[PDB]
Amino acid sequence: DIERPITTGVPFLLVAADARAAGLGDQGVATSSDVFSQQWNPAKYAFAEDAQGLSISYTPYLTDLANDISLGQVTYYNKINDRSAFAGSFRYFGFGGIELRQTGDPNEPTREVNPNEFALDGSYSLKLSETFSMAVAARYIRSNLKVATEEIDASAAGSFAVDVAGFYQSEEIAYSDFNGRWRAGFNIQNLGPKISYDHDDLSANFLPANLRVGGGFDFIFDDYNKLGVSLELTKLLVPTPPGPGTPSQSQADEANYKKYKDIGWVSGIFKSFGDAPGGFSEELKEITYSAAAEYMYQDAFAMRLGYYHESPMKGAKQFFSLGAGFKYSMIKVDVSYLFSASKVKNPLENTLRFSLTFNFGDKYETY
Amino acid sequence: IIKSDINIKADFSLRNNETLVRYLDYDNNQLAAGQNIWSLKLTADYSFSKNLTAIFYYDHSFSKAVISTSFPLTNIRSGFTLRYNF
Amino acid sequence: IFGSNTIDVKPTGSVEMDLGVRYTKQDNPAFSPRNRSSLTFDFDQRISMSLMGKIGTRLEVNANYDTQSTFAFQNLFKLAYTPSEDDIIQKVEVGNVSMPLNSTLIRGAQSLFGVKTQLQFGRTTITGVFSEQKSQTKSVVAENGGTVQNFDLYALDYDNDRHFFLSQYFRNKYDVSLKNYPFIDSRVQITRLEVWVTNKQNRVTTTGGGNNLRNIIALQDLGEAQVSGVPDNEVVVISSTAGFFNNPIDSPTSNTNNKYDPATIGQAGSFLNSNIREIVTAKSGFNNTNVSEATDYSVLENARKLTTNEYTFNPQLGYISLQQRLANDEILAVAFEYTVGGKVYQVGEFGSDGVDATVVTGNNSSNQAIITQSLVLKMLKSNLTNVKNPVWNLMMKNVYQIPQAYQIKQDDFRLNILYTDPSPINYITPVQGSSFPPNPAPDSKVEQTPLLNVFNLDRLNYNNDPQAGGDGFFDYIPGVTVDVQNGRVIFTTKEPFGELIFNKLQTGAGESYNDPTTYNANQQKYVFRNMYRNTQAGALQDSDKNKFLLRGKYKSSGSNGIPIGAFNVPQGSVVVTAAGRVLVEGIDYSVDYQLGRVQILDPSLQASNTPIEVSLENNSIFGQQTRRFMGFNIEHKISDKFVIGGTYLKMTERPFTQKSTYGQESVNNTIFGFNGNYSTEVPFLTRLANKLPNIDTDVPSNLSIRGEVAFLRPDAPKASDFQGEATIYVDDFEGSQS
Amino acid sequence: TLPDVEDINRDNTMSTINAYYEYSIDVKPGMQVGENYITDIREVTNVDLPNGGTTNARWIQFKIPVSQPQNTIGNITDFRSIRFMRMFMTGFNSQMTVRFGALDLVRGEWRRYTGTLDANDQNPDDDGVEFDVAAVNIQENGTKCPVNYVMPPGVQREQLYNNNTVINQNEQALAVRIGGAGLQYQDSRAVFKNVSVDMRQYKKLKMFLHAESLPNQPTLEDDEMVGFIRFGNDFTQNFYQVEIPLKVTKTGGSCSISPDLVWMDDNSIDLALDLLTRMKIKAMSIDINSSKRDVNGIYYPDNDPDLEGGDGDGKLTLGIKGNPNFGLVRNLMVGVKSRADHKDIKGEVWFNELRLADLENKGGMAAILNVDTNMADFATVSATGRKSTIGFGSLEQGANERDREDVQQYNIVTNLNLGKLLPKKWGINLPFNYAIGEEVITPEYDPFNQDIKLDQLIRETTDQAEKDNIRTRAIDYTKRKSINFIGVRKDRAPEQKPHVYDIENFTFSQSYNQVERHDYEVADYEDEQSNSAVNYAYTFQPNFNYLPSNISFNTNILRQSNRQQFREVEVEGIGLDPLYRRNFAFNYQYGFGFNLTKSLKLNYSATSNNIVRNFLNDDNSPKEDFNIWDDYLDIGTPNQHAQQLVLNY
Amino acid sequence: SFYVSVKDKTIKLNSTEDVMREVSIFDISGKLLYNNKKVENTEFQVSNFQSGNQVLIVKVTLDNGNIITKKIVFN
Amino acid sequence: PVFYSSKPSGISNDDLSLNTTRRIYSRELYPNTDIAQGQIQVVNTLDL
Numbered sequence A: 001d002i003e004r005p006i007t008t009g010v011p012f013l014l015v016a017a018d019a020r021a022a023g024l025g026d027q028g029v030a031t032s033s034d035v036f037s038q039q040w041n042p043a044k045y046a047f048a049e050d051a052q053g054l055s056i057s058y059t060p061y062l063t064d065l066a067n068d069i070s071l072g073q074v075t076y077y078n079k080i081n082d083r084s085a086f087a088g089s090f091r092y093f094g095f096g097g098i099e100l101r102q103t104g105d106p107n108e109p110t111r112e113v114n115p116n117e118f119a120l121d122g123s124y125s126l127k128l129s130e131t132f133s134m135a136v137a138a139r140y141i142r143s144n145l146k147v148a149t150e151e152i153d154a155s156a157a158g159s160f161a162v163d164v165a166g167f168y169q170s171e172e173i174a175y176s177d178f179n180g181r182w183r184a185g186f187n188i189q190n191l192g193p194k195i196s197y198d199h200d201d202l203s204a205n206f207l208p209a210n211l212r213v214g215g216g217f218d219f220i221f222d223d224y225n226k227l228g229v230s231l232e233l234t235k236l237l238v239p240t241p242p243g244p245g246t247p248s249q250s251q252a253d254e255a256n257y258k259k260y261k262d263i264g265w266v267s268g269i270f271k272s273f274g275d276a277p278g279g280f281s282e283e284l285k286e287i288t289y290s291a292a293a294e295y296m297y298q299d300a301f302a303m304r305l306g307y308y309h310e311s312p313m314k315g316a317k318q319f320f321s322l323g324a325g326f327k328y329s330m331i332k333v334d335v336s337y338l339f340s341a342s343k344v345k346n347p348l349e350n351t352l353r354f355s356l357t358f359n360f361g362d363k364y365e366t367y
Numbered sequence B: 001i002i003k004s005d006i007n008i009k010a011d012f013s014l015r016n017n018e019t020l021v022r023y024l025d026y027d028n029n030q031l032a033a034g035q036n037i038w039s040l041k042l043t044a045d046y047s048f049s050k051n052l053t054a055i056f057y058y059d060h061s062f063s064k065a066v067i068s069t070s071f072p073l074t075n076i077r078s079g080f081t082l083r084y085n086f
Numbered sequence C: 001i002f003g004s005n006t007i008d009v010k011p012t013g014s015v016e017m018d019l020g021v022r023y024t025k026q027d028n029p030a031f032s033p034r035n036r037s038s039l040t041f042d043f044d045q046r047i048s049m050s051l052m053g054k055i056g057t058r059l060e061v062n063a064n065y066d067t068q069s070t071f072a073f074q075n076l077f078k079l080a081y082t083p084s085e086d087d088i089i090q091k092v093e094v095g096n097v098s099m100p101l102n103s104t105l106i107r108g109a110q111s112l113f114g115v116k117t118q119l120q121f122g123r124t125t126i127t128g129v130f131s132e133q134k135s136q137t138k139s140v141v142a143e144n145g146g147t148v149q150n151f152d153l154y155a156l157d158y159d160n161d162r163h164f165f166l167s168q169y170f171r172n173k174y175d176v177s178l179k180n181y182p183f184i185d186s187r188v189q190i191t192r193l194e195v196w197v198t199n200k201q202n203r204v205t206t207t208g209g210g211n212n213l214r215n216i217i218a219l220q221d222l223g224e225a226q227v228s229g230v231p232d233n234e235v236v237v238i239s240s241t242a243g244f245f246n247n248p249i250d251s252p253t254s255n256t257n258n259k260y261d262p263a264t265i266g267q268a269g270s271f272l273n274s275n276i277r278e279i280v281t282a283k284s285g286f287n288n289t290n291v292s293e294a295t296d297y298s299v300l301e302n303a304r305k306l307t308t309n310e311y312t313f314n315p316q317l318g319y320i321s322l323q324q325r326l327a328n329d330e331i332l333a334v335a336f337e338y339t340v341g342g343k344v345y346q347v348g349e350f351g352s353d354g355v356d357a358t359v360v361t362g363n364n365s366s367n368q369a370i371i372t373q374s375l376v377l378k379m380l381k382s383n384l385t386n387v388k389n390p391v392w393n394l395m396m397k398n399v400y401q402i403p404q405a406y407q408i409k410q411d412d413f414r415l416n417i418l419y420t421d422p423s424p425i426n427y428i429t430p431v432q433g434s435s436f437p438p439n440p441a442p443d444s445k446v447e448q449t450p451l452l453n454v455f456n457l458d459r460l461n462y463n464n465d466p467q468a469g470g471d472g473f474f475d476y477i478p479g480v481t482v483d484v485q486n487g488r489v490i491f492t493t494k495e496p497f498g499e500l501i502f503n504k505l506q507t508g509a510g511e512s513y514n515d516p517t518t519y520n521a522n523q524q525k526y527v528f529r530n531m532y533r534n535t536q537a538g539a540l541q542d543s544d545k546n547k548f549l550l551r552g553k554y555k556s557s558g559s560n561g562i563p564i565g566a567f568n569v570p571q572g573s574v575v576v577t578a579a580g581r582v583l584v585e586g587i588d589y590s591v592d593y594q595l596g597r598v599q600i601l602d603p604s605l606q607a608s609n610t611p612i613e614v615s616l617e618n619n620s621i622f623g624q625q626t627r628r629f630m631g632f633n634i635e636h637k638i639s640d641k642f643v644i645g646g647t648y649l650k651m652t653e654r655p656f657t658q659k660s661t662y663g664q665e666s667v668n669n670t671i672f673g674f675n676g677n678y679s680t681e682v683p684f685l686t687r688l689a690n691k692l693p694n695i696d697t698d699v700p701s702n703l704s705i706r707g708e709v710a711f712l713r714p715d716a717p718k719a720s721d722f723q724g725e726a727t728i729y730v731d732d733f734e735g736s737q738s
Numbered sequence D: 001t002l003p004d005v006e007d008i009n010r011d012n013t014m015s016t017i018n019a020y021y022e023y024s025i026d027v028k029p030g031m032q033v034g035e036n037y038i039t040d041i042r043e044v045t046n047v048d049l050p051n052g053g054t055t056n057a058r059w060i061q062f063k064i065p066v067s068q069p070q071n072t073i074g075n076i077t078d079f080r081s082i083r084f085m086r087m088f089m090t091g092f093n094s095q096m097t098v099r100f101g102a103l104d105l106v107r108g109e110w111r112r113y114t115g116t117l118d119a120n121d122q123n124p125d126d127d128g129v130e131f132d133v134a135a136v137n138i139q140e141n142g143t144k145c146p147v148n149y150v151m152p153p154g155v156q157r158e159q160l161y162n163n164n165t166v167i168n169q170n171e172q173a174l175a176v177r178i179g180g181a182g183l184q185y186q187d188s189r190a191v192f193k194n195v196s197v198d199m200r201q202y203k204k205l206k207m208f209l210h211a212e213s214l215p216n217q218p219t220l221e222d223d224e225m226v227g228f229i230r231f232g233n234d235f236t237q238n239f240y241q242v243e244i245p246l247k248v249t250k251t252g253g254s255c256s257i258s259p260d261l262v263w264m265d266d267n268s269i270d271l272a273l274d275l276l277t278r279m280k281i282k283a284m285s286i287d288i289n290s291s292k293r294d295v296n297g298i299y300y301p302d303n304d305p306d307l308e309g310g311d312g313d314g315k316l317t318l319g320i321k322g323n324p325n326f327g328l329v330r331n332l333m334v335g336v337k338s339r340a341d342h343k344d345i346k347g348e349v350w351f352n353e354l355r356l357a358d359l360e361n362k363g364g365m366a367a368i369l370n371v372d373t374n375m376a377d378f379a380t381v382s383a384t385g386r387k388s389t390i391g392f393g394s395l396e397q398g399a400n401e402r403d404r405e406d407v408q409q410y411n412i413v414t415n416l417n418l419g420k421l422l423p424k425k426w427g428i429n430l431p432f433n434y435a436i437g438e439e440v441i442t443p444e445y446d447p448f449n450q451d452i453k454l455d456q457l458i459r460e461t462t463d464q465a466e467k468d469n470i471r472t473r474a475i476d477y478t479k480r481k482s483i484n485f486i487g488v489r490k491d492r493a494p495e496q497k498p499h500v501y502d503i504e505n506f507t508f509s510q511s512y513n514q515v516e517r518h519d520y521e522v523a524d525y526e527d528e529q530s531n532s533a534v535n536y537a538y539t540f541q542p543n544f545n546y547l548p549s550n551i552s553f554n555t556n557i558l559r560q561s562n563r564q565q566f567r568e569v570e571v572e573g574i575g576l577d578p579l580y581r582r583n584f585a586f587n588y589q590y591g592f593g594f595n596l597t598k599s600l601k602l603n604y605s606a607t608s609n610n611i612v613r614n615f616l617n618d619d620n621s622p623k624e625d626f627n628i629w630d631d632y633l634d635i636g637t638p639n640q641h642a643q644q645l646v647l648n649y
Numbered sequence E: 001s002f003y004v005s006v007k008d009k010t011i012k013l014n015s016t017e018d019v020m021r022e023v024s025i026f027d028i029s030g031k032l033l034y035n036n037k038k039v040e041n042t043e044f045q046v047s048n049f050q051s052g053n054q055v056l057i058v059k060v061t062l063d064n065g066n067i068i069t070k071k072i073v074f075n
Numbered sequence F: 001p002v003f004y005s006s007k008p009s010g011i012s013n014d015d016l017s018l019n020t021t022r023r024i025y026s027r028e029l030y031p032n033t034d035i036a037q038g039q040i041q042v043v044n045t046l047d048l
Ligand SMILES: CCCCCCCCCCC(CCCCCCCCCC)(CO[C@H]1O[C@@H](CO)[C@H](O[C@@H]2O[C@@H](CO)[C@H](O)[C@@H](O)[C@@H]2O)[C@@H](O)[C@@H]1O)CO[C@H]1O[C@@H](CO)[C@H](O[C@@H]2O[C@@H](CO)[C@H](O)[C@@H](O)[C@@H]2O)[C@@H](O)[C@H]1O
Pocket: A054, A056, A076, A330, A358, A360, A361, B002, B048, B049, B050, B051, B052, B082, B083, B084, C015, C016, C017
């Protein structure tokens, strides 16, 4: 099963937060530009068709067990020129309100705790050429999951991170049977200082520094039927912890952990490439991939199919995803569902994701 | 360019409770229970459109300790709730 | 691909967003200064959307999303693609789908999420499904309306720490007084009872019966006189009974029975001084020498009086049943008063007749003396458990709680006693090389005697009139053998699996129930003395004795209709089988799907006592493994009245981990089968009917023949396999050591 | 914020009793595992400190068995009321800090078996044997000094997702330690669990075992300690016994030993339950007083000189005492036994992953035939025939829920509209219902012994009377008959004036039900129910008025007859005396409403329950030869009579 | 109506006359920590070491078959 | 935790490096026990 997973702080940052990308196998780095294109590739906000947009996303957790445990996302973008765009997003994971009750009469004033985790990020995307765009994003992450007790301090832990992303979208290219369009993108995510959950420099966790690379092709037939095929590759930019031993018996393990944990995040980013006994063939074992297909009808109905594969030695998250999208006038609705293919219970099994986006403002022509 | 009425609703409450146990034959009035809660709930409506409504809310609650087994508790909830109709 | 290019999927409902801050400050000084206040961000979503519409006259959408909907199955999403009638593909459905089957052996599933495809090749139609099943199959059995609930209780599983004899007198009167039940051979009528327990709630209110807090001293031996068949050491803990008792041997329990009489505290020859009234000097309040703080007495300072809703009591048999069991170090103490004809007896001190709680001398706080005085009560349970003291014997061990039984009635309650060694047999056989006592009394027969008679539970007929060997049924007497309000069964002896069966097996006076070394080797295997002389956990060490089984059933009807134990049942998932035949959903019964009520409409079935089986899907489940439901159904039509079928179904459960513990197994079952349906019209039967004396009908006569064969191929998933073999863990020992 | 009070359990009362158990621990610089209750030591080599330096550290795990107090203060004899815990430090001469990374009371699901297991000693609470049961964890005992805890080969830690974090679950083994004076030659110590396990659908019972010597004690040698499982319905009379001599893991060098040497395959239990069945069938032929039995009464086939092949397992020693049943295991015991004759052995034994393997997944089949016909709105017939074999079931049913029985069943229901045989002018509703059917159920397993298949038991009997008894007592047979006349009435003419004496105001219902059964528990069972009802109702249509506004009346004859003859399972020669329940009742109620005045109003009602006791003798003994129709129109003596009067003014 | 209290890592179920039939306590990972089919309106003792988890989900099945869910903090 | 997270006046880094005062993390006592990220990673020892 899962041998030597990468341990990072705030792992909620890597969860797909919108139904459209979830339905496409948790990938968005090289799909078409959309309102949710901040977690995946902020650089394609410069390629948006509408001037500005707002989105609400709901990803419930443990739906059979409890309500109000969910990951919510609000995104707003505003492309001002034909070349630039501003975007701000807010991802929020919370357990809902929990009342701290110790009986002591059924009218006692009870404290209510709301353990939660959120990331607030803003990005600016600029079109360098007519087909290429870049973006920089700044993110504030705050983790507040623990509940205050005696001898447990529930002070929130925070960190800052930056993202550098690029998006390529070619013009329409006519072929023998169709006039297709190519897409590519990269996103280096969550680059920032380590997050200290216990507010001590000796005990700090790497931010989930992530590299997403992907490409996409759009099969366009009959000028109103689209088949979008996209591929994505993802690698964590965090050093892998030591395993059996690489210098008594436990002394080697403790020394290896000590040398692993005394690694800077900047140096850890470069040490992610390697730091394992295996070669390049076994280095590819740290790469996750996802393949997706999206059929578009009139640009108002979409059907999404996606496969996500994490190498079962790490994480072991393998699933198929189905998604559908509907656009009424200015409102888009997206739902997605996950079919797990791994031994380990996926927390998002048997869960329907829901996304809702509003598009308003002027309309920009696509090149 | 956008005109709407602002509906203000404010609700204040102050509740005092006291349980006393009194001895008849000597001065032994025992404070056995108590509660000294006050709460304030403010709300403010604004219809930005026929479908879009913005509400500001401010809930402030303070419970004072009457006997030492209870701790003073302040609960403040304030923010904006955006509501859209289809 | 779609008929038109119009898209009219329209959203309905609302979306609500909360953006705010939560601030909390609780002034607990024990908290760290770092936890002085909590300032968190508040974000909430309240989506209540609905999506209905059409895409190009071929695609249909019916979606509904509610974040506030309890249970996630109510968030529906259905995509139906219906092409032209000339196409091979007749229907594609994605989302919430169902796979209904017209089969008795192979049931379909109604609560599925996946893809359902229907094809047609001329006259053969193939329906395939691949989905995840969101529901669980549940079955209930109903007779005469109400659902049947079966129960199984071994003798060791009595209702412990809840039922207490008020005195040794009542405990030793119990068996003889119930010899000729329902007639009770006792004139005792408990008229007043006050029950006190250790106060841990420590909450003062005016509404729950007031604020009656008192200091208590509970004496183990209070009010006890000697007993004819029992030596004094199992009646009273007191070290020496010399000069203790002052009433004749078999006197009813009463304060005046011994020298612990609270009315004579410190008079001339009392065993108690006035120091007994004070908590501080409680030990010095005894005149006798060897007195221990948890054996002879127990003290409480702010003992709380139970209200009448926290216990019931049997006024004739002199025992009490608490609402909440005292499974811990709690202290139980009572004062009670009862009549025997014109005679009134009191055993404790009531608040009305006890000493005052407080006496104050002096005029101001500098010279005032506070005397706080305790009520003298009878101890029913001590602070520290000692199974060798007589107070232990006050706890009744002959009361069995029928699980979840609330308002049991006769004709809706069955109970039998069986000996399971290992199979359930309703009689007892002697140890090989021995025999049961010869020439027994008719009430003492054991050989070839049903265990209901052996344990004195069947001497009456249906109308509770005595019948020689019983009627074969448990004697249902609401004040003696059953507690109707709480669903409890009470044996007519205090130790049915101990002394009663010992006596039925006794062959001579050399055998003594209290000396197991004298047992006659039938008593050695059948007498469970330890379940009465030891705690339940202690009795676990006598593993060979817990073989007597209380088995039965009760019917809970309550209101009209069968309660099927589920709510918002999916439509079309309810199957009702009466006597091996499947009933018809519109003729024989009706279903109220929201409340989970099945109403039987066939008049013959309602007046039949025939057990009715109800199968249904319920999606009100949690913590369940993911279930994959896949398969196909072939429905070739041979002619207009002849159709054959080809069902094949597979269901795989996905285990949470690779270790399946016993009870939480995963299945990988496959089922397939074939069906035939031949439905003709027979005008000959109509003509024959018109040949009958006064019949001039013209409705057609139909004949319908249905056959089906099914094959089940079970298995377990490869995920829960250890070293290539399907594995169930009886104990991996990860759940030990809490 | 709480006042200081001399009342710690907050029961308002200050206890002064000093009856408690004493346990003690030495605190000294060089403590080692195996003494002073120390069970594990974890050395920490280089701790990063906030000042930039490093330090050594040593974490010591203690486990103080509560059942082995060093001393007793006052009068306490059991552990049923333990209300307080106290810790205090003494003996130190200077400032001493003790830091508790953990401090717990630990409770286990496995209970030490008190009481003797071998009859040779029969004095368990003596001899100074230290018997401790605990658990060894991968999370807490990876540095255990004699042998580090490792998973058995092939065993993996379970993995779950907490919140986007992979969590490896703990892997634990049950550890039993024998110390003090040690184990006598044939003495044993064991722990037990009360369970409910059906092992009939699996072929193998497996468990990992490990044995090691105690530090500072004489070394344990191979095949001196015997691990055993004892399971069944008890531990003294009805159990299977599975024993295995234990090879001891060699200690003395490094603490880290490979899992293949910690959990030797030679020490693994791999028991085929068919061997248990063979042993039970063979022990059927062994007398309980036979010399082939042990002093405990256990029959060991391996010790039987006249049996070839022993118990069929070369590695395991199998035993059986008194007809246990692995179809319903109520009691599970694991323990250690000694085989060293002139020695007192000490050591530690681990038990891990007790499991069932090799699912018996042969399936089954079922066939259903339905015939439904209607005869021109006069007659309807529905016939059903079902046949299912052992192993069939639903898709959702697990290993122990699928059919362990062959079922043959049919059912015929007929409905006749007998009112159509009379002229439609004077219309009579005369519906007739007739239902018949029976089901035959043959179990896979013989109900006696509960875990031997019926076919195998019949084959291995070699006695015609016993074979016939076994075959017939297993059949579960039910026959049902239903005859109904519910709702008999005459409809009014299309234009007819209602009258008080009209026969149109009456309704008649007759129901008859009969169930005949015989199965493993009852050799003869008959249930008969008859229900006759007559209903009347008439509403009159328009000193004070005396004409009633309405009149109601209904009568009910209810007869229930039960005959139960419980079977003697051993022989079909006599049977128990049959038991009779009879519930012959006669019920009638009448009511009428008045409207004496436009304001006055009177409703009267009376109900009467009569019981018919014609089936009883002069003494309280039932009559066997009393038919349910004997005196049908007999009103008995009154049992309950009620009246109700309602007056509105 | 139904309220759950946790004092000293002891969970107590208090229902206003609603009789409960089964209790299941789940970790935030969805893991079953404690199942009891013999609920007695009483105090359950769940093993106190939960590897840093604080939030538990209590699922209570009543006799009628309804399910009551409460999120608690294991302190 | 105030001694470790926001050092009060008069408390130095040496005062917090003693094996009698230092913060104990679960990884030191339980190296094989996995704690979810953001959950409690410190062992709150009872010190006598
Ligand atoms: C970080 C958060 C940012 C949030 C931005 C909110 C923007 C709200 C603008 C309302 C809006 C967008 C729809 C949003 C609905 C999604 C709400 C989802 C809530 C989920 C819980 C509805 O407009 C649509 O909705 C219909 C509503 O019925 C309208 O009907 C009518 O609606 C009413 C006439 O507008 C009638 O009075 C009503 O009679 C009708 O019915 C239609 O006109 C139209 O289809 C139209 O947007 C337009 O309004 C202007 C006003 O200044 C905004 O100007 C900009 O504002 C800043 C940009 O913010 C910029 O900086 C600023 O430079 C710039 O001046 C632009 O936005 C503009 O494009």
